[PDB]
Design a protein around this ligand. Structure first.
Ligand SMILES: CCCCCCCCCCCCCCCCCC(=O)OC[C@H](COP(=O)(O)OCCN)OC(=O)CCCCCCCCCCCCCCCCC
Ligand SMILES: CCCCCCCCCCCCCCCCCC(=O)OC[C@H](COP(=O)(O)OCCN)OC(=O)CCCCCCCCCCCCCCCCC
Ligand SMILES: CCCCCCCCCCCCCCCCCC(=O)OC[C@H](COP(=O)(O)OCCN)OC(=O)CCCCCCCCCCCCCCCCC
Ligand SMILES: CCCCCCCCCCCCCCCCCC(=O)OC[C@H](COP(=O)(O)OCCN)OC(=O)CCCCCCCCCCCCCCCCC
Ligand SMILES: CCCCCCCCCCCCCCCCCC(=O)OC[C@H](COP(=O)(O)OCCN)OC(=O)CCCCCCCCCCCCCCCCC
Ligand SMILES: CCCCCCCCCCCC(=O)OC[C@H](COP(=O)(O)OCC[N+](C)(C)C)OC(=O)CCCCCCCCCCC
Ligand SMILES: CCCCCCCCCCCC(=O)OC[C@H](COP(=O)(O)OCC[N+](C)(C)C)OC(=O)CCCCCCCCCCC
Ligand SMILES: CCCCCCCCCCCC(=O)OC[C@H](COP(=O)(O)OCC[N+](C)(C)C)OC(=O)CCCCCCCCCCC
Ligand SMILES: CCCCCCCCCCCC(=O)OC[C@H](COP(=O)(O)OCC[N+](C)(C)C)OC(=O)CCCCCCCCCCC
Ligand SMILES: CCCCCCCCCCCC(=O)OC[C@H](COP(=O)(O)OCC[N+](C)(C)C)OC(=O)CCCCCCCCCCC
Lengths: 77, 491, 54, 90, 642, 43, 132
């Protein structure tokens, strides 16, 4: 109605660019390094913890079967 | 008679709103009483009906037993069996409550065609409500894709500048994916000769045929709830869709996928779910971590909240795929909690700020607490609720889902705790910026929050706190129903 | 390998299901059963997170 | 009033009779919540014993805590699909 | 008398928050102070019954979680350890509230400052009164929410709005690990109740016990501002002085130590964690004492003083001497709260309202009351014999050598350096502000006076407690054989006997001898031989000074290399994934492919009899070819599309 | 012990041991190259 | 001296977006007249594409010393402490215990520490007094 927001010309170019980054993206050898890390390194990275330890962690009330405290003190002398 | 009353009433209501408005087209100029005051006499009818639908489920609620195992209120209408259990009762109840708030949110910020808008909202609300109370895979699909027809037209007619881009995204992403679910639904109808829930819950399939069915159904779920890497449609849709569309989309529609896991995967593909559960956790946890880092480097106001909803829907999927009652109950509570906080944020961001200043760039706004104190109060409170504050309902969902994951997989499920830290960064950085430093020089001082906008926030905040302080209103109903999904043999 | 060819050879589910007849040999691709040997679940799902042990 | 649990083991029924199969699923559930409740009572003793004993809680609550840890792994909702869809004898 | 002690500040906090507009300003500050005063009285009544008459209280309101075996109730128990935390919190917070009435008299927003300030007090009371670990977490989170509002109170100041976010987020990093630790408590034990969990400590595996308490330790590092997460502690000075007078004495700062003390039944059976706790304290005590000596701000020095003194409580935990740490926590809540209030009165007294200590000098005659409060506090902070600091600080350092281990010996020197450094920067602060030639304009001194009675009353009350309180409360906590089973000390870890008997005489006086000798030596150099302390000559001494003055560069390493790097990862996902490959494998990529293919197809639709004739004849080759060659024709047909 | 991953594969006619008489790729590929060379060349 | 924050590109080619080298607005002079005085930005100034990491709301950038200089000093500080700790451990210079560790009767309170039978004993017992 009364244009309560004092529109800034250079803000619009900023928002217009930030909403259209995908147009100017090019699949070079650097974008290929970041795609690999984020989609094939990390997902496979957690793809081994999620399977090397799946069904191998019986932690519910895991009792203690080992002494903790030393019984015989041997001085260095 | 729930469904029979529910469909017939809305169909009667749709015809009533059709008759009163479209009778005056004729050859005469629109000098009519009904359209006086922006069709106020045709909006009020639409708002009354959405309130009445809430009264229909309550009539069948008082008869609902919280202890009997199985589907209740089993009724046959249109040769389809409709039933209600513990999980379907709360999701239907939540869906209908968001009806009136969706209409009331766009009460005075449309350029015209309020009668069309009202009918579109009601059809979306009823079809969503009916989706939780069906009893076969085929009927689940019908109400899982019928919403596309009103939703595609609602966004295009009542959208933002990029509505054309978003109207395609909602229509094609939810059809090119759900079709992959039609294949798996059809395979059940071929080898079993029925898609009824109870019939297919008791049948075990070969180890391979469960995987082929799981993939076909998980594809239609991983898209409906935005899960990486097919999440690239919701942020566009949320930015362009109207306030009524954004409230329903992230309030109920995205929770259909969580409910879709309950009906379509856990009971009948129980073995293969245990095989896929480690895979789901890697996909979900990276969705949580990425969708919270991506939100840091955003600029658009409504897109920022759009990615926030994705993170809190990754926590739901992590919890639901846990094989214990702790994970499953918290995942369902979080869906209920996220069914009020997420719509509330779109009212603050895209329903109050946008409706006055007509822009969505985070660079303009800052220090709004100087001349909009009431807006800040609900901005801070709904920000702390959305981050997992203990007194909110998000925490109860977020604690139990995180705890439920740890029980299933203590190692990778520990990374689910990242939601506690990550949700604080992108969210408060928005709340800190919107309410910090001197009042912005680009914004003129305008009216503060009005009575209508206050009402929505107060009735979207109270259910969130009530569930947070005392979630036994919700847990008690779910405890029997959620205990059926669990698959384990202990010797 | 199609369902129709498998069905016509007795590999389908035409006669319904029963749970007393527990097949030791692995079922066919399209075949459905009410109940399955535990050893087959242990071979597929593996022992661990709630199968046999906790 | 207080409806009881229709004790029906899966091995006695034929799954085709849907009414029977519902009973064997409900019965297995309702006998699993009783075990969780008996866990709560057992743990309700451990809390009272620990506070009243004080420094003596390592000897006056030894068996109660020992039983609680022994019963903890399997006193939780397990569901019926685990035993319905599996036959342990094979 | 329990329910009154807990929820009274909440009622006072809400009255000013919502009814504050209707009850003015002055009538809104005193009601909030009234609500806290009720809680102060009720705490002493409980303290009389709990510690002396061995009565415990518990008010179970209603259930909170009832998901299968996991049951959590909104209950608040008040046992010996809980009351020993209510004494520092509730008493100081009332004095901070009493102090803030006349400190914040000129602030335009007073009905809001006391709304959050008391809400902070209630958020701490819930923390130290929950009877299960989850209720503790409800309080634990709301220290951060209350602090975030209070630290960023002046939301029109950029350095203060950003400082609130830094204090909120780093704590959430601690809270992220606390949630994870709580989950492993439900996994291993099935509940988060103190009674259930602590009764199982000797029967649970060490590795499962270690995993939980490492998470608690990371949660505690954020709150107690220990090494690696201490950047927020100094950035919190952007809030009002009463906020620093409350957060850094008996509040948010100390909340890390209380969590580790409460977990004594679990912490005992994991020697590895107690080693990590001990080593964090020694480094944090050593580093903070060094940074404080070259800082040039009155509130930074005192803020760094707390981090050193909190670290002393950490090393006392690491030797399984939980009683010593709790007792030193209570003492430190009085001779460190008094420092902030008195320092907050020095800044108020001067009309230029400077905070840099290099613009002060010769204030002793002009404001002798504010000097006297600092001097008594400073001696207590220096553990001079006879005062409260001596009865608490020395014994902790005594027991660093009293464990007679390698790790115990190393931390002893780190404590001993920080024991001396405490005596060195304390003299520096007083000399730079009370015994130095004037630096401020002469117009200030003819207006440099004292403050009103309201601002003076709390400081005198704390001044007395900073002399006598340590002596009166020593035998309750540090007595020989006092029954304090709320804190568990394993029989193999009772080294209090060797500490108080086998230490040579030299150790018992060594911190004082270096403290008194080092302070006087520095005092002469500052007065008669100040030419040495111009560090711009020796480039080695200039680089050293500029190193500790920037706080070990950890602020620069955190901002420029982690937050800056962390934000860049979010930018990479936004560019190469969200707007990157997932847009090439999406609407933007599929528009190119569709436009490419549909361009080829539209050429084929053109009215020509010869064109349609060849394709009809071409299709006759399908019948001729053996049907094993369909896949090749499919490959060829795609080739022709290009 | 290996990993337990899902197996989404449609059934195929499994040629057991002693079956699967190998096909001569050199001759089979010769027919395609010579056959496709004439058709495109002749046309 | 006044290095830019890390991870700031040198050349960006975003279609027709104007090319301007990044300027960190945090280091601008507060005394000059600015339209956006809090953010120290004149009206309608062009913005860098990654300007979110340069304006005031971005994390504060400390440019007092070179980052590799900071790592050098910060690592140097703990190198001395590691040196001091390592030297002592090599020769065992730290004092030895003046007495035997604290002892207890009843087989070192084995039963009092939740030892059911004489088989456990050492699983729970503390140091045991041999002068019973
Ligand atoms: C005036 C006459 C009123 C209609 C009376 C009648 O014909 O009864 C038929 C039927 C009643 O149902 P009945 O046959 O007794 O058994 C239950 C099966 N529905 O009643 C009906 O069949 C009415 C069904 C029409 C109402 C639904 C119209 C389409 C709904 C589309 C929903 C889209 C989402 C699904
Ligand atoms: C924002 C905060 C978000 C939350 C913080 C991040 C959470 C993830 C980081 C911590 C992960 C939780 C800790 C899990 C590892 C320790 C758990 C454990 O104690 O069990 C280890 C388990 C074997 O069990 P144990 O009892 O120790 O040995 C008995 C052998 N007979 O098996 C093992 O021995 C090793 C287990 C795998 C070790 C990996 C742990 C690091 C995980 C990093 C994730 C990838 C990065
Ligand atoms: C923001 C806008 C304002 C709107 C939101 C305001 C916040 C909401 C405050 C109220 C929250 C709703 C919960 C109150 C409803 C009572 C819940 C309840 O049913 O209690 C159950 C309790 C025990 O259960 P049972 O034995 O089965 O008996 C009940 C059978 N009908 O049965 C009982 O004996 C009843 C016990 C009633 C206790 C009074 C309620 C206390 C609520 C305040 C304390 C909340 C917990 C403490 C949290 C404070 C922070 C630590
Ligand atoms: C450890 C793994 C790294 C975890 C980092 C998390 C990823 C990045 C998230 C940070 C996003 C940036 C942000 O939160 O906003 C910027 C804000 C600015 O704060 P600042 O400028 O320093 O305040 C100065 C006031 N005068 O910066 C902040 O206030 C963020 C506060 C810090 C958040 C946690 C930082 C990690 C703490 C663990 C460090 C371990 C070192 C030992
Ligand atoms: C989050 C889960 C782990 C992801 C690790 C990602 C690490 C990474 O990709 O580092 C790349 C980034 C610098 O890469 P880049 O911006 O392309 O360099 C151009 C210089 N002209 O380097 C960084 O941004 C630092 C990230 C450090 C991660 C630890
Ligand atoms: C948002 C992004 C979504 C990403 C989704 C990530 C899903 C998780 C991937 C796990 C992969 C995995 O487990 O890979 C490993 C597997 C298993 O074989 P192996 O390694 O030899 O097993 C080692 C067994 N030992 C150690 C006992 C000898 O290898 C595969 O056949 C990978 C096939 C999957 C990709 C096609
Ligand atoms: C829950 C079960 C519902 C079943 C019944 C549905 C009735 C549909 C309406 C028919 C009457 C009509 O087409 O009327 C048109 C109405 C009203 O238009 P108006 O804005 O008032 O016109 C005013 C004109 N002036 C301004 C000139 C005066 O708008 C609609 O199209 C809204 C509802 C349908 C939209 C999507 C239809 C596609 C459905 C696909 C499968 C679900
Ligand atoms: C045990 C020893 C404790 C340290 C005593 C040093 C005296 C001091 O810290 O002060 C002595 C001087 C300067 O005096 P100032 O008050 O720090 O600065 C006065 C203010 N000017 C400079 C603006 C005038 O500083 C230093 O060279 C500090 C060195 C600290 C690190 C010591 C070695 C690191 C290992
Ligand atoms: C197996 C996982 C399934 C996931 C869902 C399916 C992928 C999502 C595709 C959405 C595209 C969209 O929405 O189409 C929108 C796009 C382009 O957008 P525009 O409006 O022209 O904007 C861009 C404006 N420019 C370009 C002028 C700047 O149009 C098209 O390219 C039309 C063709 C769409 C092909 C759909 C094929 C689906 C195949 C799915 C099985 C592999
Ligand atoms: C960071 C750098 C800090 C200084 C370098 C420490 C080097 C060192 O020697 O530290 C070694 C120490 C001590 O362990 P220990 O020698 O086995 O103790 C002996 C075992 N008792 C005590 C049972 C007899 O352990 C650490 O590292 C502790 C962690 C340090 C902080 C992280």
């Amino acid at each position: 109605g009364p244009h309560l927001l004092r529109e800034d010309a250079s803000f619009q170019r900023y928002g217009q660019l930030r909403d259209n980054l995908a147009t100017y993206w090019k699949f070079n050898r650097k974008a290929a390094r970041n795609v690999f890390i984020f989609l094939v390194a990390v997902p496979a990275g957690l793809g081994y913890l999620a399977y090397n330890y799946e069904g191998k962690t019986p932690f519910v009330g895991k009792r203690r079967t080992e002494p903790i405290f030393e019984q015989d003190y041997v001085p260095r002398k | 008679m729930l469904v029979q009353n529910l469909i017939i009433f809305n169909i009667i209501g749709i015809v009533l709103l059709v008759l009163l408005n479209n009778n005056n087209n004729g050859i005469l100029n629109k000098k009519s009483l009904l359209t006086i005051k922006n069709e106020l006499k045709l909006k009020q009818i639409g708002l009354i009906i959405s309130i009445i639908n809430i009264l229909i489920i309550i009539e069948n609620w008082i008869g609902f037993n919280s202890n009997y195992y199985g589907f209740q209120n089993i009724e046959r209408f249109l040769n389809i069996y409709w039933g209600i259990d513990g999980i379907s009762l709360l999701l239907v109840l939540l869906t209908l409550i968001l009806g009136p708030i969706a209409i009331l949110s766009n009460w005075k910020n449309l350029k015209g065609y309020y009668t069309y808008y009202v009918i579109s909202i009601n059809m979306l609300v009823i079809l969503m409500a009916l989706n939780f109370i069906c009893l076969d895979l085929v009927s689940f699909y019908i109400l899982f894709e019928s919403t596309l027809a009103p939703l595609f037209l609602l966004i295009g007619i009542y959208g933002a500048n990029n509505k054309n881009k978003a109207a395609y995204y909602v229509l094609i992403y939810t059809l090119a994916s759900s079709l992959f679910m039609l294949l798996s639904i059809v395979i059940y109808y071929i080898i079993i000769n029925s898609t009824d829930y109870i019939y297919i819950n008791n049948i075990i399939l070969s180890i391979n045929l469960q995987s082929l069915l799981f993939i076909g159904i998980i594809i239609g779920i991983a898209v409906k709830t935005p899960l990486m890497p097919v999440h690239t449609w919701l942020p566009t849709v949320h930015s362009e869709s109207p306030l009524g569309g954004s409230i329903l989309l992230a309030g109920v529609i995205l929770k259909l996928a969580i409910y879709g896991v309950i009906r379509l995967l856990l009971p009948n593909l129980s073995e293969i779910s245990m095989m896929f559960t480690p895979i789901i956790y890697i996909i979900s946890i990276l969705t949580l971590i990425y969708s919270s880092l991506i939100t840091l480097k955003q600029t658009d106001l409504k897109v920022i909240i759009a990615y926030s909803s994705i993170s809190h829907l990754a926590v739901c999927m992590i919890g639901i795929f846990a094989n214990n009652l702790i994970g499953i109950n918290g995942s369902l509570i979080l869906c209920l909690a996220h069914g009020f906080v997420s719509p509330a944020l779109f009212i603050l961001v895209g329903g109050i700020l946008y409706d006055r200043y007509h822009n969505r760039l985070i660079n303009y706004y800052q220090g709004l607490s100087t001349f909009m104190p009431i807006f800040s109060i609900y901005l801070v409170v709904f920000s702390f609720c959305n981050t997992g504050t203990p007194l909110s309902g998000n925490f109860v969902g977020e604690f139990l889902s995180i705890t439920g994951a740890v029980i299933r997989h203590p190692i990778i499920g520990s990374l689910t705790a990242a939601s506690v830290l990550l949700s604080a960064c992108y969210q408060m950085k928005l709340t800190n910026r919107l309410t910090g430093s001197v009042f912005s020089q680009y914004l003129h001082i305008t009216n503060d929050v009005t009575n209508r906008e206050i009402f929505l926030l107060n009735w979207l905040l109270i259910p969130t706190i009530i569930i947070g302080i005392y979630p036994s209103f919700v847990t008690n109903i779910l405890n029997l129903a959620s205990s059926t999904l669990i698959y384990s043999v202990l010797i | 390998n199609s369902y129709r060819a498998a069905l016509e050879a007795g590999n389908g589910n035409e006669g319904g299901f029963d749970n007393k007849v527990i097949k030791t040999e692995r079922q066919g691709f399209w075949e459905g059963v009410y109940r399955r040997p535990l050893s087959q679940t242990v071979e597929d799902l593996g022992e661990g997170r709630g199968i046999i042990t906790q | 009033d207080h409806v009881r649990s229709p004790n029906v083991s899966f091995d006695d029924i034929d799954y085709n009779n849907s009414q029977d199969l519902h009973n064997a699923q409900e019965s297995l559930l309702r006998e699993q919540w009783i075990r969780v409740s008996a866990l709560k009572v057992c743990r309700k003793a451990l809390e009272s014993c620990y506070k009243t004993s004080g420094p003596n809680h390592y000897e006056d609550c030894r068996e109660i805590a020992e039983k609680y840890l022994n019963m903890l792994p399997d006193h939780r909702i397990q569901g019926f699909l685990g035993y319905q869809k599996n036959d342990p004898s094979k | 008398m329990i329910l009154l002690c807990i929820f009274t500040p909440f009622l006072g906090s809400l009255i000013s928050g919502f009814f504050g507009r209707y009850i003015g300003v002055n009538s809104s500050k005193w009601i909030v102070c009234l609500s806290i005063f009720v809680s102060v009285v009720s705490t002493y009544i409980l303290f009389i019954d709990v510690i002396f008459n061995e009565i415990e209280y518990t008010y179970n309101i209603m259930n909170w979680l009832n998901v299968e075996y996991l049951v959590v109730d909104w209950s608040f128990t008040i046992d010996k350890l809980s009351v020993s935390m209510l004494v520092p919190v509730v008493t100081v917070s009332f004095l901070v509230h009493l102090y803030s009435v006349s400190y914040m008299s000129h602030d335009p927003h007073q009905q809001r400052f006391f709304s959050y300030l008391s809400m902070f007090t209630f958020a701490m009371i819930v923390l130290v009164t929950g009877d299960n670990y989850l209720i503790l977490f409800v309080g634990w989170e709301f220290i951060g929410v209350a602090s975030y509002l209070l630290i960023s109170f002046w939301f029109t100041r950029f350095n203060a709005v950003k400082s609130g976010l830094s204090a909120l987020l780093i704590n959430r990093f601690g809270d992220a690990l606390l949630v994870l630790g709580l989950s492993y408590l439900v996994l291993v034990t099935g509940s988060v109740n103190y009674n259930t969990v602590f009764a199982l400590g000797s029967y649970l595996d060490v590795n499962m016990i270690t995993v939980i308490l490492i998470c608690f330790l990371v949660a505690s590092m954020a709150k107690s501002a220990q090494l690696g997460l201490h950047s927020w502690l100094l950035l919190a000075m952007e809030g009002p002085t009463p906020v620093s007078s409350l957060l850094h004495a008996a509040c948010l700062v100390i909340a890390g130590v209380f969590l580790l003390m409460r977990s004594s039944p679990l912490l005992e059976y994991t020697p590895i964690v107690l080693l990590l706790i001990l080593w964090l304290g020694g480094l944090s005590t050593l580093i903070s004492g060094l940074i404080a000596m070259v800082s040039n701000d009155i509130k930074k020095i005192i803020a760094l003083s707390t981090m050193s003194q909190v670290g002393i409580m950490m090393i006392a935990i690491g030797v399984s001497c939980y009683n010593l740490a709790l007792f030193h926590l209570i003492c430190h809540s009085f001779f460190k709260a008094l420092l902030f209030m008195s320092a907050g009165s020095v800044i108020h007294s001067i009309i230029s309202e400077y905070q840099d200590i290099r613009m002060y000098g010769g204030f002793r005659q002009f404001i002798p009351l504010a000097y006297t409060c600092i001097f008594i506090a400073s001696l207590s902070l220096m553990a001079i014999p006879g005062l409260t600091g001596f009865y608490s600080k020395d014994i902790i350092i005594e027991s660093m050598y009293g464990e007679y281990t390698f790790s115990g010996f190393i931390i002893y020197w780190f404590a001993l350096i920080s024991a001396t450094c405490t005596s060195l920067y304390s003299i520096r602060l007083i000399y730079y502000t009370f015994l130095n030639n004037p630096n401020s304009p002469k117009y200030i001194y003819i207006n440099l006076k004292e403050n009103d009675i309201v601002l003076i009353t709390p400081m005198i009350i704390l001044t007395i407690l900073s002399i006598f309180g340590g002596y009166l409360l020593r035998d309750i906590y540090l007595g020989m054989g006092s029954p304090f089973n709320e804190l568990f000390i394993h029989p193999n870890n009772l080294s209090l006997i060797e500490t108080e008997f086998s230490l040579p005489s030299i150790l018992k006086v060594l911190p004082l001898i270096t403290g008194l000798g080092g302070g006087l030596i520095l005092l002469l150099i500052y007065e008669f031989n100040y030419s040495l302390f111009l560090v711009y000559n020796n480039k080695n001494l200039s680089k050293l000074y500029s190193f500790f003055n920037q706080k070990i560069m950890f602020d620069q390493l955190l901002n420029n290399l982690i937050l800056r790097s962390g934000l860049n990862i979010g930018w990479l996902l936004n560019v190469h994934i969200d707007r990157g490959i997932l847009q090439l494998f999406g609407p933007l990529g599929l528009w190119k492919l569709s436009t490419f293919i549909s361009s080829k197809l539209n050429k084929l639709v053109f009215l020509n009899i010869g064109f349609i004739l060849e394709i009809i004849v071409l299709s006759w080759l399908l019948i001729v070819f053996k049907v094993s060659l369909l896949k090749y024709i499919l490959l060829l047909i795609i080739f022709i599309i290009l | 012990e290996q990993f337990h991953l899902p197996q989404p594969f449609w059934p195929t006619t499994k040629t057991k041991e002693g079956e699967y008489v190998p096909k001569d790729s050199i001759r089979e590929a010769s027919k395609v190259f010579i056959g496709s060379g004439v058709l495109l060349g002749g046309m | 001296k006044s290095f830019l924050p890390h991870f700031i590109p040198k050349n960006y080619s975003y279609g027709d977006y104007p090319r301007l080298k990044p300027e960190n607005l945090q280091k601008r002079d507060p005394y000059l007249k600015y339209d956006d005085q809090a953010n120290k930005r004149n009206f309608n100034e062009p913005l860098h594409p990654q300007q979110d990491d340069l304006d005031m709301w971005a994390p504060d950038h400390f440019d007092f010393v070179q980052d590799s200089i900071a790592l050098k000093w910060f690592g140097t500080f703990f190198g001395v402490l590691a040196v001091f700790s390592s030297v002592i451990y090599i020769g065992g210079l730290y004092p030895e215990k003046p007495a035997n560790p604290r002892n207890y009767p009843f087989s070192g309170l084995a039963k009092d520490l939740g030892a059911s039978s004489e088989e456990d004993t050492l699983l729970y017992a503390a140091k045991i007094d041999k002068s019973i």
